[PDB]
Design a protein around this ligand. Structure first.
Ligand code: AN7
Ligand code: MG
Length: 500
Protein backbone atom coordinates (compact mmCIF):
# COMPACT_ATOMS: atom_id res chain seq x y z
CA UNK A 1 0.00 0.00 0.00
CA UNK A 2 3.06 2.23 -0.35
CA UNK A 3 3.82 4.93 -2.91
CA UNK A 4 0.52 6.78 -2.50
CA UNK A 5 -0.62 10.18 -1.27
CA UNK A 6 -1.82 9.99 2.34
CA UNK A 7 -4.23 12.64 3.56
CA UNK A 8 -2.73 15.12 6.01
CA UNK A 9 -3.03 14.15 9.65
CA UNK A 10 -3.79 10.46 9.16
CA UNK A 11 -1.76 8.22 11.48
CA UNK A 12 0.74 6.19 9.47
CA UNK A 13 0.49 3.23 8.94
CA UNK A 14 -2.97 3.55 10.52
CA UNK A 15 -2.88 1.31 13.58
CA UNK A 16 -3.78 2.78 16.97
CA UNK A 17 -0.08 2.20 17.71
CA UNK A 18 1.20 4.04 14.60
CA UNK A 19 4.45 5.89 15.24
CA UNK A 20 4.17 8.22 12.25
CA UNK A 21 1.60 10.61 10.76
CA UNK A 22 1.08 12.14 7.34
CA UNK A 23 2.55 15.66 7.17
CA UNK A 24 2.55 15.86 3.39
CA UNK A 25 3.55 19.45 2.55
CA UNK A 26 6.12 21.89 3.87
CA UNK A 27 3.46 24.38 4.99
CA UNK A 28 2.09 21.65 7.26
CA UNK A 29 5.60 20.73 8.44
CA UNK A 30 6.23 24.35 9.42
CA UNK A 31 2.87 24.57 11.18
CA UNK A 32 3.52 21.32 13.02
CA UNK A 33 7.05 22.15 14.15
CA UNK A 34 6.07 25.70 15.15
CA UNK A 35 3.09 24.39 17.17
CA UNK A 36 0.51 26.31 15.13
CA UNK A 37 -2.81 25.48 16.78
CA UNK A 38 -4.80 25.03 13.56
CA UNK A 39 -2.15 22.67 12.19
CA UNK A 40 -2.00 20.66 15.42
CA UNK A 41 -5.76 20.20 15.42
CA UNK A 42 -5.64 18.88 11.84
CA UNK A 43 -2.43 16.89 12.51
CA UNK A 44 -2.61 15.98 16.20
CA UNK A 45 -0.85 12.61 15.99
CA UNK A 46 2.91 12.33 16.33
CA UNK A 47 5.83 10.14 17.19
CA UNK A 48 5.04 8.84 20.70
CA UNK A 49 8.22 10.16 22.35
CA UNK A 50 7.43 13.65 21.00
CA UNK A 51 3.62 13.95 21.11
CA UNK A 52 1.84 11.96 23.86
CA UNK A 53 -0.42 9.25 22.50
CA UNK A 54 -4.13 9.99 23.15
CA UNK A 55 -4.52 6.84 25.27
CA UNK A 56 -1.58 7.91 27.45
CA UNK A 57 -3.12 11.36 27.87
CA UNK A 58 -6.45 9.82 28.86
CA UNK A 59 -4.89 7.42 31.37
CA UNK A 60 -2.97 10.33 32.88
CA UNK A 61 -6.13 12.43 33.18
CA UNK A 62 -8.06 9.60 34.83
CA UNK A 63 -5.25 8.47 37.15
CA UNK A 64 -4.83 12.06 38.34
CA UNK A 65 -8.56 12.18 39.19
CA UNK A 66 -7.87 9.67 41.99
CA UNK A 67 -5.04 16.34 44.58
CA UNK A 68 -6.80 16.30 41.21
CA UNK A 69 -5.02 19.45 39.99
CA UNK A 70 -0.12 17.83 35.42
CA UNK A 71 0.96 14.17 35.37
CA UNK A 72 3.78 12.79 33.20
CA UNK A 73 3.43 9.02 32.93
CA UNK A 74 6.52 6.83 32.63
CA UNK A 75 7.44 3.24 31.82
CA UNK A 76 8.52 2.51 35.41
CA UNK A 77 8.88 3.91 38.90
CA UNK A 78 12.63 3.93 38.25
CA UNK A 79 12.10 6.14 35.20
CA UNK A 80 9.80 8.43 37.19
CA UNK A 81 12.34 8.82 40.00
CA UNK A 82 15.13 9.57 37.51
CA UNK A 83 13.03 12.20 35.73
CA UNK A 84 12.02 13.86 39.01
CA UNK A 85 15.63 13.96 40.21
CA UNK A 86 16.92 15.38 36.92
CA UNK A 87 14.14 17.99 36.98
CA UNK A 88 15.04 19.17 40.49
CA UNK A 89 11.67 18.10 41.86
CA UNK A 90 11.10 16.70 45.35
CA UNK A 91 11.25 12.89 45.48
CA UNK A 92 7.53 12.79 46.32
CA UNK A 93 6.88 14.13 42.82
CA UNK A 94 7.49 10.57 41.58
CA UNK A 95 4.41 8.56 42.49
CA UNK A 96 2.72 5.25 41.79
CA UNK A 97 -0.97 5.45 40.86
CA UNK A 98 -3.66 2.91 40.00
CA UNK A 99 -6.28 2.57 37.26
CA UNK A 100 -8.25 -0.40 35.96
CA UNK A 101 -6.32 -2.95 38.01
CA UNK A 102 -3.00 -1.52 36.79
CA UNK A 103 -0.15 0.24 38.57
CA UNK A 104 1.05 3.37 36.82
CA UNK A 105 4.17 5.41 37.52
CA UNK A 106 4.57 9.08 36.80
CA UNK A 107 5.81 12.47 37.91
CA UNK A 108 3.57 15.25 39.21
CA UNK A 109 4.80 18.38 37.41
CA UNK A 110 4.75 21.92 38.83
CA UNK A 111 2.65 24.60 37.17
CA UNK A 112 5.48 27.16 37.37
CA UNK A 113 9.23 26.86 37.00
CA UNK A 114 11.35 24.80 34.60
CA UNK A 115 10.71 21.50 36.39
CA UNK A 116 7.92 20.42 34.05
CA UNK A 117 10.03 20.96 30.94
CA UNK A 118 13.07 19.20 32.40
CA UNK A 119 11.06 16.16 33.51
CA UNK A 120 9.46 15.86 30.08
CA UNK A 121 12.87 16.22 28.44
CA UNK A 122 14.31 13.42 30.58
CA UNK A 123 11.49 11.02 29.70
CA UNK A 124 11.76 12.02 26.03
CA UNK A 125 15.52 11.83 25.51
CA UNK A 126 15.80 8.51 27.41
CA UNK A 127 12.72 6.85 25.89
CA UNK A 128 11.20 6.23 29.32
CA UNK A 129 7.57 6.88 28.34
CA UNK A 130 4.46 4.74 28.84
CA UNK A 131 3.61 2.89 25.64
CA UNK A 132 0.27 3.09 23.85
CA UNK A 133 -0.17 -0.69 24.13
CA UNK A 134 0.14 -0.47 27.90
CA UNK A 135 -2.24 2.50 28.05
CA UNK A 136 -4.66 0.65 25.76
CA UNK A 137 -4.67 -2.32 28.13
CA UNK A 138 -5.29 -0.03 31.12
CA UNK A 139 -8.28 1.56 29.38
CA UNK A 140 -9.66 -1.71 28.07
CA UNK A 141 -9.37 -3.50 31.42
CA UNK A 142 -11.13 -0.53 33.05
CA UNK A 143 -13.99 -0.74 30.54
CA UNK A 144 -13.20 2.70 29.10
CA UNK A 145 -12.63 1.72 25.45
CA UNK A 146 -14.67 -0.75 23.41
CA UNK A 147 -11.85 -2.72 21.83
CA UNK A 148 -8.15 -3.14 21.19
CA UNK A 149 -6.18 -2.80 17.97
CA UNK A 150 -5.98 -6.14 16.18
CA UNK A 151 -2.43 -6.98 15.07
CA UNK A 152 -0.07 -9.90 14.58
CA UNK A 153 2.01 -10.73 17.65
CA UNK A 154 4.19 -13.64 18.75
CA UNK A 155 3.30 -13.98 22.43
CA UNK A 156 5.31 -17.12 23.33
CA UNK A 157 8.39 -15.93 25.29
CA UNK A 158 8.79 -12.85 23.06
CA UNK A 159 11.77 -11.27 24.82
CA UNK A 160 13.78 -14.47 24.45
CA UNK A 161 12.69 -14.72 20.79
CA UNK A 162 13.76 -11.15 20.01
CA UNK A 163 17.03 -11.48 21.92
CA UNK A 164 17.83 -14.75 20.13
CA UNK A 165 17.10 -13.23 16.73
CA UNK A 166 19.38 -10.29 17.51
CA UNK A 167 22.11 -12.53 18.93
CA UNK A 168 22.21 -14.35 15.60
CA UNK A 169 22.10 -11.12 13.60
CA UNK A 170 24.97 -9.53 15.56
CA UNK A 171 26.98 -12.73 15.94
CA UNK A 172 27.09 -12.95 19.74
CA UNK A 173 26.84 -16.32 21.54
CA UNK A 174 23.26 -15.91 22.76
CA UNK A 175 20.56 -13.83 24.45
CA UNK A 176 22.65 -13.26 27.57
CA UNK A 177 24.56 -10.63 25.56
CA UNK A 178 21.41 -8.80 24.38
CA UNK A 179 19.34 -6.52 26.61
CA UNK A 180 15.98 -5.19 25.42
CA UNK A 181 14.99 -1.66 26.35
CA UNK A 182 11.92 0.55 26.03
CA UNK A 183 13.04 2.32 22.81
CA UNK A 184 16.23 2.97 20.88
CA UNK A 185 16.98 5.94 23.12
CA UNK A 186 16.35 3.86 26.23
CA UNK A 187 18.99 1.44 24.94
CA UNK A 188 21.47 4.24 24.15
CA UNK A 189 20.92 5.87 27.54
CA UNK A 190 21.26 2.53 29.33
CA UNK A 191 24.51 1.75 27.50
CA UNK A 192 25.97 5.20 28.22
CA UNK A 193 24.94 5.06 31.89
CA UNK A 194 26.34 1.54 32.30
CA UNK A 195 29.70 2.44 30.77
CA UNK A 196 29.80 5.62 32.85
CA UNK A 197 29.17 3.65 36.05
CA UNK A 198 31.86 1.05 35.29
CA UNK A 199 34.37 3.77 34.41
CA UNK A 200 33.70 6.08 37.38
CA UNK A 201 36.03 4.30 39.82
CA UNK A 202 39.05 4.98 37.59
CA UNK A 203 38.35 8.71 37.29
CA UNK A 204 37.01 8.39 33.73
CA UNK A 205 34.00 10.70 33.49
CA UNK A 206 34.29 12.27 30.01
CA UNK A 207 32.70 11.22 26.72
CA UNK A 208 33.66 11.94 23.11
CA UNK A 209 30.75 12.26 20.67
CA UNK A 210 31.92 11.45 17.13
CA UNK A 211 30.28 13.75 14.59
CA UNK A 212 26.76 15.09 14.62
CA UNK A 213 24.55 12.14 15.58
CA UNK A 214 20.90 11.57 16.43
CA UNK A 215 19.55 14.64 18.19
CA UNK A 216 18.19 12.88 21.29
CA UNK A 217 21.57 11.22 21.81
CA UNK A 218 23.24 14.63 21.56
CA UNK A 219 20.72 16.03 24.05
CA UNK A 220 21.58 13.28 26.57
CA UNK A 221 25.06 14.82 26.85
CA UNK A 222 24.33 18.50 26.15
CA UNK A 223 21.48 18.64 28.68
CA UNK A 224 23.35 16.49 31.25
CA UNK A 225 20.62 13.84 31.26
CA UNK A 226 23.66 11.63 31.70
CA UNK A 227 25.79 13.57 34.18
CA UNK A 228 29.12 13.46 32.34
CA UNK A 229 31.43 15.86 30.63
CA UNK A 230 31.56 15.60 26.88
CA UNK A 231 33.31 16.89 23.77
CA UNK A 232 31.90 16.71 20.26
CA UNK A 233 34.36 16.09 17.43
CA UNK A 234 32.29 17.57 14.58
CA UNK A 235 34.01 15.77 11.69
CA UNK A 236 33.46 11.99 12.11
CA UNK A 237 36.16 11.33 9.49
CA UNK A 238 38.85 13.42 11.24
CA UNK A 239 40.72 10.68 13.07
CA UNK A 240 43.68 12.96 13.78
CA UNK A 241 41.36 15.31 15.66
CA UNK A 242 39.75 12.39 17.50
CA UNK A 243 43.21 11.35 18.69
CA UNK A 244 44.08 14.92 19.68
CA UNK A 245 40.93 15.26 21.81
CA UNK A 246 41.53 11.82 23.33
CA UNK A 247 45.10 12.82 24.23
CA UNK A 248 43.79 15.98 25.93
CA UNK A 249 41.61 13.71 28.11
CA UNK A 250 44.15 10.89 28.51
CA UNK A 251 43.18 8.59 31.37
CA UNK A 252 39.90 10.47 31.70
CA UNK A 253 37.73 9.18 28.83
CA UNK A 254 34.86 6.91 29.84
CA UNK A 255 33.70 6.27 26.29
CA UNK A 256 33.32 7.28 22.67
CA UNK A 257 29.88 7.19 21.08
CA UNK A 258 29.44 6.89 17.31
CA UNK A 259 26.75 6.03 14.77
CA UNK A 260 26.98 4.03 11.55
CA UNK A 261 25.87 5.79 9.36
CA UNK A 262 24.96 8.92 11.36
CA UNK A 263 21.48 10.45 11.62
CA UNK A 264 20.80 12.36 9.45
CA UNK A 265 24.10 13.30 7.81
CA UNK A 266 24.87 9.66 6.89
CA UNK A 267 28.59 9.84 7.69
CA UNK A 268 30.27 6.48 8.25
CA UNK A 269 33.18 6.54 10.75
CA UNK A 270 36.25 4.28 10.62
CA UNK A 271 35.35 1.74 13.28
CA UNK A 272 38.62 -0.28 13.20
CA UNK A 273 40.56 2.96 13.72
CA UNK A 274 38.19 4.03 16.51
CA UNK A 275 38.74 0.67 18.22
CA UNK A 276 42.49 1.27 18.31
CA UNK A 277 41.94 4.79 19.66
CA UNK A 278 39.55 3.46 22.32
CA UNK A 279 42.02 0.72 23.31
CA UNK A 280 44.79 3.29 23.75
CA UNK A 281 42.45 5.58 25.72
CA UNK A 282 41.18 2.77 27.95
CA UNK A 283 37.62 3.74 27.05
CA UNK A 284 34.62 1.90 25.70
CA UNK A 285 33.35 2.35 22.15
CA UNK A 286 29.56 2.50 21.89
CA UNK A 287 28.18 2.21 18.34
CA UNK A 288 24.58 2.85 17.28
CA UNK A 289 24.16 0.77 14.11
CA UNK A 290 20.42 1.40 13.62
CA UNK A 291 20.76 2.94 10.17
CA UNK A 292 23.06 0.23 8.75
CA UNK A 293 21.36 -2.74 10.53
CA UNK A 294 23.26 -5.84 11.71
CA UNK A 295 22.26 -7.51 8.44
CA UNK A 296 24.57 -5.10 6.56
CA UNK A 297 27.51 -4.49 8.92
CA UNK A 298 29.48 -6.57 11.44
CA UNK A 299 30.47 -4.08 14.15
CA UNK A 300 30.58 -6.19 17.34
CA UNK A 301 34.28 -7.03 16.61
CA UNK A 302 35.09 -3.31 16.91
CA UNK A 303 32.58 -2.06 19.49
CA UNK A 304 32.32 -2.74 23.19
CA UNK A 305 28.56 -2.09 23.08
CA UNK A 306 26.19 -1.81 20.11
CA UNK A 307 22.76 -0.14 20.32
CA UNK A 308 19.83 -0.40 17.93
CA UNK A 309 16.41 1.20 17.67
CA UNK A 310 14.17 -1.78 16.86
CA UNK A 311 11.42 0.78 16.08
CA UNK A 312 12.97 1.05 12.60
CA UNK A 313 13.84 -1.66 10.07
CA UNK A 314 14.04 -4.49 12.64
CA UNK A 315 10.23 -4.38 12.72
CA UNK A 316 9.37 -2.57 9.49
CA UNK A 317 5.87 -1.84 10.82
CA UNK A 318 6.15 1.76 12.11
CA UNK A 319 4.01 0.74 15.07
CA UNK A 320 6.23 -0.33 18.00
CA UNK A 321 9.13 1.21 19.91
CA UNK A 322 11.91 -0.93 21.37
CA UNK A 323 15.67 -0.85 21.69
CA UNK A 324 18.51 -3.33 22.04
CA UNK A 325 21.87 -3.20 23.79
CA UNK A 326 24.37 -5.78 22.53
CA UNK A 327 27.44 -6.44 24.66
CA UNK A 328 30.55 -7.59 22.81
CA UNK A 329 31.67 -10.90 24.39
CA UNK A 330 35.35 -10.07 23.86
CA UNK A 331 35.17 -6.62 25.42
CA UNK A 332 37.18 -6.12 28.63
CA UNK A 333 34.03 -4.36 29.88
CA UNK A 334 31.75 -7.31 29.05
CA UNK A 335 31.51 -8.87 32.52
CA UNK A 336 30.97 -5.54 34.27
CA UNK A 337 28.45 -4.46 31.62
CA UNK A 338 26.29 -7.57 32.10
CA UNK A 339 26.41 -6.98 35.87
CA UNK A 340 25.57 -3.27 35.68
CA UNK A 341 23.19 -3.02 32.68
CA UNK A 342 20.08 -4.31 34.57
CA UNK A 343 20.25 -1.17 36.74
CA UNK A 344 19.64 1.16 33.76
CA UNK A 345 16.60 1.58 31.55
CA UNK A 346 13.50 -0.55 31.29
CA UNK A 347 12.49 -3.56 29.26
CA UNK A 348 9.53 -2.76 26.99
CA UNK A 349 6.02 -3.65 28.01
CA UNK A 350 5.67 -7.29 27.05
CA UNK A 351 2.91 -6.72 24.48
CA UNK A 352 5.24 -4.33 22.66
CA UNK A 353 7.94 -7.01 22.78
CA UNK A 354 5.45 -9.53 21.36
CA UNK A 355 4.82 -7.21 18.41
CA UNK A 356 8.59 -6.95 17.88
CA UNK A 357 8.84 -10.74 18.04
CA UNK A 358 6.36 -11.16 15.19
CA UNK A 359 7.85 -8.39 13.04
CA UNK A 360 11.54 -9.25 13.52
CA UNK A 361 11.07 -12.63 11.81
CA UNK A 362 11.30 -10.95 8.41
CA UNK A 363 14.28 -8.68 9.19
CA UNK A 364 16.89 -10.26 6.92
CA UNK A 365 14.52 -10.71 3.99
CA UNK A 366 13.30 -7.12 4.41
CA UNK A 367 16.84 -5.78 4.23
CA UNK A 368 17.60 -7.62 0.98
CA UNK A 369 14.77 -5.71 -0.69
CA UNK A 370 15.49 -2.43 1.11
CA UNK A 371 19.15 -2.56 0.07
CA UNK A 372 18.29 -3.08 -3.60
CA UNK A 373 15.80 -0.21 -3.52
CA UNK A 374 18.29 2.19 -1.95
CA UNK A 375 20.84 1.34 -4.63
CA UNK A 376 18.28 1.90 -7.38
CA UNK A 377 17.07 5.20 -5.95
CA UNK A 378 20.62 6.49 -5.41
CA UNK A 379 21.32 6.05 -9.13
CA UNK A 380 18.05 7.83 -9.94
CA UNK A 381 18.97 10.79 -7.73
CA UNK A 382 22.36 11.14 -9.42
CA UNK A 383 20.53 11.50 -12.76
CA UNK A 384 18.70 14.67 -11.58
CA UNK A 385 21.59 17.14 -11.12
CA UNK A 386 19.34 20.16 -11.78
CA UNK A 387 17.29 19.33 -8.66
CA UNK A 388 19.46 17.14 -6.40
CA UNK A 389 22.64 18.89 -5.25
CA UNK A 390 24.04 16.00 -3.15
CA UNK A 391 22.94 12.65 -1.69
CA UNK A 392 24.66 11.49 1.50
CA UNK A 393 24.54 7.76 2.20
CA UNK A 394 26.73 4.79 3.10
CA UNK A 395 28.19 4.34 -0.39
CA UNK A 396 28.86 7.94 -1.34
CA UNK A 397 32.45 9.11 -1.91
CA UNK A 398 32.81 10.30 1.70
CA UNK A 399 31.69 7.10 3.39
CA UNK A 400 32.14 4.12 1.06
CA UNK A 401 35.69 3.25 2.14
CA UNK A 402 34.85 3.31 5.85
CA UNK A 403 31.62 1.37 5.26
CA UNK A 404 33.47 -1.35 3.33
CA UNK A 405 35.67 -2.00 6.38
CA UNK A 406 32.70 -3.38 8.34
CA UNK A 407 30.18 -4.30 5.63
CA UNK A 408 29.15 -7.94 5.43
CA UNK A 409 29.91 -9.87 2.25
CA UNK A 410 26.23 -9.77 1.29
CA UNK A 411 25.76 -6.39 2.96
CA UNK A 412 24.19 -3.38 1.28
CA UNK A 413 23.82 0.29 2.21
CA UNK A 414 20.61 0.06 4.22
CA UNK A 415 17.55 2.12 3.41
CA UNK A 416 18.37 5.76 4.12
CA UNK A 417 19.42 8.49 1.70
CA UNK A 418 19.85 12.12 2.78
CA UNK A 419 18.90 14.19 -0.25
CA UNK A 420 20.17 17.77 -0.55
CA UNK A 421 18.03 19.83 -2.93
CA UNK A 422 18.92 22.77 -5.18
CA UNK A 423 15.26 23.91 -5.08
CA UNK A 424 12.94 24.71 -2.16
CA UNK A 425 11.84 21.53 -0.42
CA UNK A 426 8.20 22.33 -1.33
CA UNK A 427 8.82 21.70 -5.03
CA UNK A 428 9.71 18.04 -4.41
CA UNK A 429 8.23 17.10 -1.03
CA UNK A 430 4.70 18.43 -1.50
CA UNK A 431 4.04 16.38 -4.66
CA UNK A 432 6.02 13.26 -3.69
CA UNK A 433 3.71 10.24 -3.36
CA UNK A 434 5.26 8.51 -0.34
CA UNK A 435 4.43 8.51 3.36
CA UNK A 436 5.82 11.83 4.61
CA UNK A 437 6.32 12.33 8.32
CA UNK A 438 8.44 11.25 11.27
CA UNK A 439 10.42 8.03 11.83
CA UNK A 440 11.83 5.64 9.22
CA UNK A 441 12.42 1.97 8.58
CA UNK A 442 8.99 0.80 7.43
CA UNK A 443 8.28 -1.67 4.65
CA UNK A 444 6.65 1.22 2.78
CA UNK A 445 8.80 4.06 1.53
CA UNK A 446 8.87 7.14 3.76
CA UNK A 447 10.42 10.57 3.65
CA UNK A 448 11.10 13.07 6.41
CA UNK A 449 11.88 16.83 6.23
CA UNK A 450 14.46 15.89 8.78
CA UNK A 451 16.18 19.24 9.35
CA UNK A 452 12.75 20.60 10.35
CA UNK A 453 12.21 17.62 12.68
CA UNK A 454 15.63 17.79 14.35
CA UNK A 455 16.43 21.50 14.19
CA UNK A 456 13.37 23.63 13.42
CA UNK A 457 14.55 26.26 15.91
CA UNK A 458 17.84 26.70 14.05
CA UNK A 459 16.12 27.02 10.66
CA UNK A 460 14.23 30.13 11.83
CA UNK A 461 17.04 32.73 11.93
CA UNK A 462 20.21 33.63 10.02
CA UNK A 463 22.49 32.65 12.91
CA UNK A 464 20.68 29.37 13.36
CA UNK A 465 21.02 28.63 9.66
CA UNK A 466 24.74 29.43 9.85
CA UNK A 467 25.09 26.91 12.68
CA UNK A 468 23.30 24.29 10.58
CA UNK A 469 25.50 25.16 7.59
CA UNK A 470 28.55 24.36 9.71
CA UNK A 471 27.10 20.86 10.19
CA UNK A 472 26.46 20.42 6.46
CA UNK A 473 22.69 20.91 6.83
CA UNK A 474 20.09 23.30 5.49
CA UNK A 475 16.34 23.65 5.12
CA UNK A 476 15.91 22.00 1.74
CA UNK A 477 16.80 18.41 2.53
CA UNK A 478 14.74 15.23 2.49
CA UNK A 479 15.66 12.03 4.33
CA UNK A 480 14.31 9.12 2.28
CA UNK A 481 13.74 5.73 3.94
CA UNK A 482 13.06 3.18 1.21
CA UNK A 483 10.59 0.37 1.77
CA UNK A 484 10.27 -3.00 0.05
CA UNK A 485 8.17 -1.92 -2.96
CA UNK A 486 9.42 -2.83 -6.48
CA UNK A 487 12.47 -0.67 -7.27
CA UNK A 488 11.06 0.52 -10.60
CA UNK A 489 7.98 1.87 -8.81
CA UNK A 490 10.05 3.73 -6.20
CA UNK A 491 12.20 5.16 -8.99
CA UNK A 492 9.15 6.24 -11.00
CA UNK A 493 7.59 7.86 -7.92
CA UNK A 494 10.69 9.97 -7.33
CA UNK A 495 11.15 10.78 -11.03
CA UNK A 496 7.65 12.27 -11.07
CA UNK A 497 8.34 14.41 -8.00
CA UNK A 498 11.77 15.57 -9.21
CA UNK A 499 10.72 16.75 -12.65
CA UNK A 500 9.17 20.21 -13.26
C1 AN7 B 1 20.36 6.21 15.00
C2 AN7 B 1 19.20 6.29 15.99
N1 AN7 B 1 19.37 5.87 17.23
C3 AN7 B 1 18.38 5.94 18.10
C4 AN7 B 1 17.14 6.42 17.74
C5 AN7 B 1 16.03 6.49 18.79
O1 AN7 B 1 15.09 5.45 18.63
P1 AN7 B 1 13.70 5.45 19.51
O2 AN7 B 1 14.06 5.78 20.93
O3 AN7 B 1 13.20 4.04 19.30
O4 AN7 B 1 12.78 6.52 18.94
C6 AN7 B 1 16.92 6.87 16.44
C7 AN7 B 1 15.54 7.41 16.08
C8 AN7 B 1 15.39 8.23 15.06
C9 AN7 B 1 14.05 8.82 14.66
O5 AN7 B 1 13.08 8.71 15.34
C10 AN7 B 1 14.03 9.58 13.35
O6 AN7 B 1 15.10 10.10 12.94
O7 AN7 B 1 12.96 9.69 12.70
C11 AN7 B 1 17.99 6.79 15.55
O8 AN7 B 1 17.90 7.20 14.21
MG1 MG C 1 26.52 18.08 1.18
Amino acid sequence: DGLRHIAAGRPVPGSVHSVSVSIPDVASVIGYESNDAATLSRISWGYPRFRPHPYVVRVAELAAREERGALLLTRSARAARAAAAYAGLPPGAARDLTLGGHVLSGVRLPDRGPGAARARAHVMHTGGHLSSRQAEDVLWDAGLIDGRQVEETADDSPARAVAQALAGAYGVPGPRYVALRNSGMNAVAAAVEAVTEIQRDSGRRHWLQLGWIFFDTMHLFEKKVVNVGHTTVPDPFDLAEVARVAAAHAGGLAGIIAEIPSNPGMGVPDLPALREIADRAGCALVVDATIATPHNVDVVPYADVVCESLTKYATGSADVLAGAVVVAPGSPFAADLLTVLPRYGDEPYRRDTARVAARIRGYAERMVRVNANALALAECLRRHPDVVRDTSWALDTRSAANYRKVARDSGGPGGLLMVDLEVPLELVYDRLAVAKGPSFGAEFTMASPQVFVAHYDLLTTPRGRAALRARGLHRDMLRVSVGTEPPELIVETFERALRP
